[PDB]
C-alpha cells in the first residue's frame, strides 16, 4: 500500500523564504510564516489567499494554532512571540522575555498555555490570557529547535543542537526524561505522536528516529532524505495510511511507511529546500513550503 | 531565522 499525493495548488505571495506552515485544527485554514516578517492565511482546500497578518519587526520561524482555530502564535527573531486574533488580524499580546531569537512555539491542547523555544537555550511557558511568562526552563546548552505538547498537555518535549531530547512535566517544569544517542548529533526537530506514546526526532545527519522515551529505545529509523543544515519539520500522517512525512534539502518531500521504514513517495516540484511540511487533520492533504529560491507553498492530495 |  502506497499513497499517491499529487500537486493541486501552488501558493505564492511571500517575498522571502517560507519558514513554517500549519493547518488549523478545524481543517479550514493553512497558516504560513516567513522570513518576510509576515503570516499569511490561505484556504486549506482551494488554496485561496485569505489575508496577511503583520507586526513583527523581524522574520518569523514558526507559527501555531489554538485548539479552537481562533488564535495564532508566532515566534520571531525580534525576540518576542505574538498572539494574534485570526479573524481580525490584530495582535492580542506580545510575549517578551527571551533574550535571543524565538525559534519554535506551540499551544497546549487546552490552549491556555504556550510553549516556546529559543536560541537563548531556554524553554518558556506562557499564559495565553495574560501574556505573562509562567516558567523559564534552563532546558538546553544550545539553541532549542523544537517544542511540542503531548495530547493532554501534561508533557512538553524539546530538542536542541546540544544533541538532547528532553521530556518535561508541564505543571512543575521538572525534567522527566533525557534522551542521549551515541555521538550526540544536533537534534533539529521533535514532536509527540498523536497517541502521545512515541516521539519523532530529526537529527542533522540525514536521519529521523521514532523513540519510546519512557524506555529510552529507538524503535524506527527513516533515511534517504537530506537533512544536515536546516531545522525541517516532520509529521505523522494518520488520516489514511500511517506515514512519516518530512521535507528535505534536496527540494523533495519524503513519505515513509511508519512500520516498515521504506520510502513510499517522493514529491517533486519545489525549487529550494523544503523547510516545512504539515498534514491535514482529516483529509489526506499535505502542505509543503520552501526557502529563498522558491518562496512558495504547495498543497498535495492523496487517495490514501 | 530558520530559513538560514
Q: What is the DSSP string of A273-295?
A: -EEEEEE-SSSSEEEEEE-TTT-
On whether residue A284 sits in a domain, the answer given is no
* Closest residue by Cα to residue A232 from A180, A178, A191: A191
What whole-number distance in Å separates Cα of residue A18 and Cα of residue A32? 7
**What is the number of residues in chain B?**
4
What are the chain B neighbours of A17 within 8 Å (beta carbons)? 1, 3
| Rounded Cα gap, residues A122 and A156, in angstroms | 13
Set of chain B residues whose Cβ sits within 8 Å of the Cβ of A74: none
CA atoms of A189 and A220, how far apart (whole Å): 16
Which grid cell is B2?
530558520
The answer to whether A26 and A69 are in contact (CB under 8 A) is: yes
Q: Residue B2 and residue A62: Cβ atoms within 8 Å?
A: yes
| A212 in Cβ contact with A201 (< 8 Å) | no
Q: Could you list the residue range(s) of the whole structural domain that residue A234 is in?
A: 16-243
Q: Is residue A34 assigned to a domain? A: yes
**Smallest CA–CA separation between B1 and chain A, in Å?**
6
Assigned domain for A280 exists: no
Q: CA gyration radius for chain A?
A: 17
Burial (CB < 10 A; 0-12, 13-18, 19+), residue A303, is exposed
Rounded CA-CA distance A291/A18 in Å is 6
Residue with cell 542533522: A204
Domain count, chain A: 1
Residues B3 and A261: their CA atoms lie apart, in Å, by 28
C-beta of residue A102 within 8 angstroms of C-beta of residue A124:
no
| A220 vs A198: CA distance, rounded Å | 10
Please tell me the distance in Å from A7's CA to the nearest CA on chain B. Answer: 23
Smallest Cα–Cα separation from A245: which of A66, A23, A42? A23
Nearest 10 degrees: Cα torsion A226, A229, A233, A236: 40
Chain A: residue nearest B4 by CA?
A230
Whole-angstrom Cα distance, residue A90 to residue A117?
23
Residue pairs spanning A and B at CB distance below 8 A: 27
* Nearest Cα residue in chain B from A289: B3
C-alpha cell of residue A156 = 512538553
DSSP A68: T
- Give the single-character DSSP code of A16: S
Q: With respect to residue A167, please indicate whether it lies within any of the assigned structural domains.
A: yes
Distance from the Cα of A119 to chain B's closest Cα (Å) equals 10
Q: How far is A147 from chain B (nearest CA, A)?
A: 14
Record: contact A101-B3, CB cut-off 8 A: no
Cell numbers describing residue A275: 523547510
Q: Is residue A184 part of a domain?
A: yes
Say which CATH number the domain at A85 has: 2.130.10.10
In a domain, A75, yes or no: yes
> The cell 523555544 sits on which residue?
A117
Has residue A23 been placed in a domain? yes
Does residue A38 sit within a domain?
yes
User: CA-CA distance, A287 to A280, in Å (whole number)?
Assistant: 8
Burial of A91 (0-12, 13-18, 19+ CB in 10 A): middle
Q: What chain B residue is nearest to A78 in terms of C-alpha separation?
A: B1
With an 8 Å Cβ cutoff, are A231 and B3 in contact?
A: no
Helix, strand, or coil (residue A180): coil
Chain B hits for A103, Cβ within 8 Å: 2
Q: How many CA atoms lie within 13 A of A290 on its CB side?
A: 25
Amino acid at each position: 500500500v502506497k499513497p499517491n499525493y499529487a500537486l493541486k495548488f501552488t501558493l505564492a505571495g511571500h517575498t522571502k523564504a517560507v519558514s513554517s506552515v500549519k493547518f488549523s485544527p478545524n481543517g479550514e485554514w493553512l497558516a504560513s510564516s516567513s522570513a518576510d516578517k509576515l503570516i499569511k492565511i490561505w484556504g486549506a482546500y482551494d488554496g485561496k489567499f485569505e489575508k496577511t497578518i503583520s507586526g513583527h519587526k523581524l522574520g518569523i520561524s514558526d507559527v501555531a494554532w489554538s485548539s479552537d482555530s481562533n488564535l495564532l502564535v508566532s515566534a520571531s527573531d525580534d525576540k518576542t512571540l505574538k498572539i494574534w486574533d485570526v479573524s481580525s488580524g490584530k495582535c492580542l499580546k506580545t510575549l517578551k522575555g527571551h533574550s535571543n531569537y524565538v525559534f519554535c512555539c506551540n499551544f497546549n491542547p487546552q490552549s491556555n498555555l504556550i510553549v516556546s523555544g529559543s536560541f537563548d537555550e531556554s524553554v518558556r511557558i506562557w499564559d495565553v490570557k495574560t501574556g505573562k511568562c509562567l516558567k523559564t526552563l534552563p532546558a538546553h546548552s544550545d539553541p532549542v529547535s523544537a517544542v511540542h505538547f503531548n495530547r493532554d498537555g501534561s508533557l512538553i518535549v524539546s530538542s536542541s543542537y546540544d544533541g538532547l531530547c528532553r521530556i518535561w512535566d508541564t505543571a512543575s517544569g521538572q525534567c522527566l526524561k533525557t534522551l542521549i544517542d551515541d555521538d550526540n548529533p544536533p537534534v533539529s526537530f521533535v514532536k509527540f505522536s498523536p497517541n502521545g506514546k512515541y516521539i519523532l526526532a530529526a537529527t542533522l545527519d540525514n536521519t529521523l528516529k521514532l523513540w519510546d522515551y519512557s524506555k529510552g529505545k529507538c524503535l524506527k529509523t527513516y533515511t534517504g532524505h537530506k537533512n544536515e543544515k536546516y531545522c525541517i519539520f516532520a509529521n505523522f500522517s494518520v488520516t489514511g495510511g500511517k506515514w512519516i512525512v518530512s521535507g528535505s534539502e534536496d527540494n523533495l518531500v519524503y513519505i515513509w511507511n511508519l512500520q516498515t521504514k521504506e520510502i513510499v513517495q517522493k514529491l517533486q516540484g519545489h525549487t529550494d529546500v523544503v523547510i516545512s511540511t504539515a498534514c491535514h487533520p482529516t483529509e489526506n492533504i499535505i502542505a509543503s513550503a520552501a526557502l529563498e529560491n522558491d518562496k512558495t507553498i504547495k498543497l498535495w492530495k492523496s487517495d490514501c | 531565522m530558520r530559513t538560514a
